[PDB]
């Protein structure tokens, strides 16, 4: 499975969650940013590694980071 | 002195390059397809 | 299920695609990445691998000498 | 003289090459009437060929066994043996023109940088300013030394971005 | 809100079939089933290729992977303002509800959700790989 | 390639006894293409022809063998995974939909080579053809001429 | 109601936008912040669909852009006619066409380039041209540089008119969408007016000018003493002397006594023995028939009266039991989508350009065109390349429609929908067909190469060893050859000498002779089948999977031109339909490169050659049959042997071809840098270079950026095709001009 991590730099834009095409991320209540919300990655087992979340992340540097890891039928996005 | 017979190539070349490859490929393919207990 | 090859990377051994065969062959000499690798075991594996390389080189030279002495002029 | 080369003026291969070149042009000049425009053109090329072989020899160029002029690039050999118009002088001529272009372009970028939209002045050229800098670029070498001595040519490392390391 | 139960005998949108449908994986590993309610019969695009007519009220479709189900989920929500839900179904009869996990779409912050894979540091505060060397396996300074 | 071309051409001319050819033809690239590559390739490409073959046949066959591998590398180097992955998926459908063929199945799910893998496989094919082509040309040109 | 509908003064004519780069785009009008903006500006300049979602505005931009193209083409033609009147040897070539080489480009004497002014003949020095203009002008009956100069002035007057029309129909009276959506009216005018009237008018020029002038030229009359075209147009007695039937006037036409005009309207076939070209009387009766046929065709669609057909009705009527709804929805797709029209038009227009190359070479329509091998090879290769490019473009715009104009609500259970529903069956079956062709086509060459290298020639596929004769093509050739006596009784001769019969020789050179087809021909025809099938596979796959695939289900949202979907799913590089066009270009280049090489070798080996006493000596001595069955044979007897002309051109007039030959090998290798690399490496290298510019305070405000992934691919393919095609171009022209 690919390793997805969220960093304190997260601003709670929710853009990564909206960009994810496999529902690997969600917004959880937080107190570190003004938006009072931070991105979480509770379903990384369904992550394929498209890195759309990173493309949607506007922080410098990225608050969401994807590290390609062990490959599975879900990770390879195989319908067979 | 350490000289193989004339038939050596007529036998060694067939075995090495055809027979041995087949044997090697067979065992190798089996191991890869085998799954951990 | 988990295949036996490669034994040095459970990750690859749990890959259900043909990529497992290619990566198992491609990452066999990267000892530092092998599962449960320690610095001492890393050195001992390399030491044995170096004896293996030397064995191959001397057989290559013996093979060369033999074919010239047996089929050349 | 140098490197065992020989003056083109005394090379036999240099002379044979000039004859070979003029004989090709002459073999062609025949198929045409004397005043025909083709004939006039082949004659002007033959005159230009004769002048080149003569001008190159007069310039004191050295020729190899191939009978072709070779250029001396060592500043020491060129100055001591009369071969400085081959690489040395050309070097200072180019360096002046190339620095001219660079110093003017740098002066332009610096001037447009203090404007409202520098990017706009790079796609749409401020012609009047560009022409002014183009003319003031003749004294670039002295300006470049004066900037190097005031410490205004370079940027402070603290103001230049770099990767994490 | 409670975890929904998948009714497998739900009517499926009108569609003549295609060649981009389920494969042997659906019978050996797992398949995905999207379900939604339609207030009117509307033609829509099958993520597997082809046009299909959604039926009035309940609708059910089966896809080979989760991405195809979420792709259809995106079109129905963005274009028809519908609210679909999908599940992973195993070959032994087991059904697993997947989205929306808590009934609230992930982009909308919801209570109860506990953060996961979050690092109380910026990426530039990660350690050098030399520190995570000779661990149980190949790992990244980020994983620590 | 440049260093070995230089060495071979300078020695071929010295061995033949006319260093002037290199001295007058090496100063322009047309000279390299015609006086080194084109001229020294005749005997090699005639290793086998409609009139028969000679001891240089293996080198003529290898010379072309290297050109083939070199060009095969271009496919792994220019074409990328996405295109191939979608093609294989169609074949997986064809195998599972083909009667009798669907009876036999694969233990490893067929997938396109990875991005890094493709770069390596392409570079290997490119490098092998590069060496085989020059080795065939070098030995044939020197041996056939001397 | 079909009617003229326009908007008045729609767009103001000012230079305000000229000074605001990127004004047409909502994203680009903001101005540049990085270098990517410059590329984006040029790459998105003619993408009106992306500029605006208004079809009427897009249609008005397309119409005026076409007037701009027509004006460009007119200037190009005026230049060719002007260079023929002021910088050519046409008048001398008219007197001696079998020895004087056509030339219409003279170079200035500078930096020694005057060497390119070769001794073409006729007391002239210039670059030899291979466009075939001299033969076209002779066929048209032009005998003076005054006529070429007058046509040049006319073309510029026409170019000015085209540019005016473009400005007027966009800024003053812009046609409304309803006007453009009158497809029934457009087809009636283009078939009846443009095509039928154009053919009728041309028949007028040929009958009153081309036929008498060329008859006098072929009789040996000096071009100076030939009557001027008007003299023939205003005097019937002269035309009556040359053609007795002209003494009867147009009475026979209206009295249905057409047989009387048999002396100028003929069905001879074959070739004029004097010139080696088709009979102009045959070309005249042909264009007259074409004109009649197209005038009828232009009265088929309904307009403002009840008579005529409705394309929507015809389409909706053609439906069968195996195709669901059938052709329903197509009329709506082909009246609201320009990309759909461009896809079909590019496909047919390219296929046509390829058909022109084959027909013009086998049936040489111009006088003295057949024996001008440089022009013949250039024409065939040029039109073949134009066709191939247009065919690849057809694929791209079909995918653009599938991604941007396709709507499922209008395509349920129709042919389009049913095709997308069995795309995997189509691509998988085509995949196997491609693999079968590859092994059974190129595998045969490998077998022959190995058998020859192993000294086993009897085990090779050849006309002497194992034989693979193209029997079907041999039977068709025999049928077409014997056609004149049975299936085509009126025709005096067969359409072409390629089918068979006696050879026609002009100037001692073979104009055309029968072309034999053996094992080597059978093998190369199957390589063509393989290369075309594979190119179709890539283009078709790119179009059918443009909206979605099993790997990527929302490809349509990503768009037509996108680099990838990330390294996930194993790697999704080059999944966009645009990337399929990128790959298709390489295979189209591979296919056509093989097609033109086949033509050149076959023609130089079995057709072209000097005719001597008792025997024809071909340029390559008929070595195609025994040398084109192995790759080694191709590399040695074609590339290596015929490259001698280009490699030995230095010091002559063909020296330019040698320079271009090297320069083209360079551009091709330079493309590999872009094709094998990635922007990630270049961006970092630029970062260190930018550092040096920052250090010396010479860093630009517009941030330097590596080319986009898609731009990197586009730059690579462009330089690959430019370099590769230019290399063949230099090789072909140097070879043919020298041994022509
Ligand atoms: C790295 C050393 C080396 C290499 C490269 C070769 C290579 C070769 N050997 Mg050889 N051989 C070697 C060592 C080697 N040998 C030694 C040490 C011995 C002593 C036992 C022999 C005894 C031997 C015999 C008796 C024969 C060969 C033959 C051959 C040739 C047949 C190729 C084949 O695959 O069939 C057979 C390959 C082998 C028997 C050796 C395997 C080496 C592979 C390439 C590794 C081949 C070129 C045959 C031959 O001469 O063909 C004309 C043959 O008759 N070899
Ligand atoms: C006299 C004591 C001695 C000797 C002779 C050696 C010898 C060797 N040790 Mg070693 N070692 C020693 C003590 C010694 N060791 C001690 C005390 C320790 C503990 C600190 C170690 C720890 C150690 C380790 C950890 C390793 C070695 C290894 C090696 C081998 C190197 C393999 C190699 O590169 O090929 C031979 C190298 C040479 C012959 C050097 C010459 C190279 C030149 C540049 C070539 C020039 C040749 C000439 C110019 C042209 C030839 C032309 C023609 C003949 C072809 C080598 C045979 C390696 C090994 O195990 O390999 C299996 C390795 O991993 N040793
Ligand atoms: C950049 C590389 C380069 C190289 C490889 C050379 C190489 C050479 N230079 Mg030189 N030179 C260079 C740059 C270079 N130069 C530059 C940039 C200048 C501008 C000042 C000069 C100015 C120069 C002069 C004035 C002379 C040479 C000379 C020479 C030749 C002998 C010089 C020597 O002894 O050692 C090599 C020299 C250098 C590595 C650096 C500069 C040359 C030194 C400073 C000159 C000392 C020469 C000395 C008198 C030895 C020659 C004795 C006698 C024959 C005069 C020699 C082949 C001498 C010569 O042969 O003239 C006929 C000579 O007198 N050069
Ligand atoms: C002096 C006459 C004139 C003036 C002042 C304008 C002014 C304007 N036109 Mg316009 N137009 C004109 C003549 C004129 N036009 C003519 C004769 C035509 C018929 C072709 C058109 C067709 C036309 C269209 C279809 C459109 C405009 C548009 C516009 C507006 C913005 C676009 C623009 O001009 O930017 C400047 C653009 C350029 C300078 C590009 C020049 C294009 C030339 C023809 C290409 C030449 C290429 C060359 C032949 C080959 C290059 C090869 C290479 C190797 C060098 C603008 C106010 C656009 C608009 O309405 O705004 C959205 C619009 O879409 N015009
Ligand atoms: C006899 C009627 C007629 C004729 C001859 C043409 C001819 C042409 N049309 Mg067309 N068209 C017509 C009727 C006609 N049309 C009608 C009734 C409609 C409305 C349904 C259209 C709508 C239409 C569109 C939308 C387009 C064309 C286009 C074209 C050009 C395509 C380029 C080509 O292949 O030819 C080769 C070019 C030549 C042979 C040059 C000669 C052209 C001269 C000017 C002939 C005159 C044509 C013109 C219609 C005559 C009236 C001019 C008058 C108003 C001053 C072509 C010249 C395309 C275009 O953009 O052209 C700019 C295009 O996009 N037409
Ligand atoms: C576009 C095709 C075309 C054109 C333009 C012509 C034109 C011509 N043909 Mg022709 N022809 C053609 C096709 C064509 N042909 C074809 C396809 C065939 C094969 C069947 C023939 C076979 C043929 C034959 C056998 C003959 C001609 C002849 C002629 C000429 C005489 C026509 C005639 O007798 O009266 C035709 C009637 C008219 C043209 C009507 C004229 C109306 C005028 C121009 C209108 C003026 C109005 C204006 C307001 C006046 C004011 C002026 C102003 C200053 C105030 C004529 C120039 C004859 C010839 O060669 O003469 C020597 C002849 O013998 N043709
Ligand atoms: C009637 C023919 C025709 C027409 C009207 C169009 C029209 C269009 N095409 Mg298209 N195309 C065609 C044929 C045609 N095409 C063919 C035959 C091919 C196959 C190669 C393509 C392949 C193609 C692709 C892949 C794409 C388009 C795109 C487009 C759209 C935007 C064009 C653009 O990007 O602007 C800008 C145009 C340029 C910047 C020109 C680039 C310069 C050229 C390519 C260099 C060629 C070499 C040149 C001759 C070298 C000169 C010498 C040199 C030393 C200077 C546009 C509506 C784009 C699109 O649809 O957007 C999504 C797109 O991606 N076309
Ligand atoms: C010389 C280089 C080369 C070669 C050989 C090929 C070959 C092939 N390409 Mg390809 N391609 C290339 C370059 C090349 N390409 C480049 C540079 C690009 C970038 C544009 C592409 C892009 C490309 C695309 C996009 C596609 C292909 C496809 C194909 C396959 C078409 C189907 C087929 O013919 O199967 C038959 C196989 C052959 C004809 C190869 C012949 C090999 C010989 C005859 C067999 C000998 C076997 C031997 C005896 C085995 C024993 C060896 C021993 C050691 C045991 C084919 C194998 C298509 C595909 O995937 O297949 C449908 C496809 O879509 N290519
Ligand atoms: C040629 C195909 C004949 C078949 C044919 O054209 O018959 C036409 C057949 C009959 O159509 P209908 O009469 O039902 O309706 C046709 C209407 O669309 C109007 O023509 O349509 C099909 O079902 C095509 C079958 C798919 C094709 C299956 C294999 C395709 C062959 C691939 C290439 C082979 C070479
Ligand atoms: C002022 C100017 C600019 C230049 C800016 C800067 C900082 C340029 C940097 C220059 C630096 C750091 C040079 C550092 C070392 C240079 C060295 C050691 C010089 C080497 C030259 C040698 C050895 C001479 C070789 C020869 C001579 C005598 C001349 C010829 O005969 C040829 C040859 C090789 C024999 C800007 C902004 C690019 C814009 C523009 C105008
Ligand atoms: S890489 Fe793709 S699947 Fe994974 S979390 Fe990011 S957007 Fe989601
Ligand atoms: S895109 Fe980045 S900043 Fe925005 S919610 Fe996701 S991780 Fe946080
Ligand atoms: S290598 Fe380039 S094209 Fe391929 S997935 Fe990565 S970024 Fe996309």
Automatic annotation (TrEMBL), chain B:
Keywords: Membrane, Photosynthesis, Photosystem I, Thylakoid, Transmembrane, Transmembrane helix. GO terms for cellular component: chloroplast thylakoid membrane; photosystem I. It is found in: Plastid, Chloroplast thylakoid membrane. One of its GO terms (biological process) is photosynthesis. May help in the organization of the PsaL subunit. Belongs to the PsaI family. This is Photosystem I reaction center subunit VIII. It comes from Chlamydomonas reinhardtii (Chlamydomonas smithii). The chain holds residues 68 to 104 of 106 of the full protein.
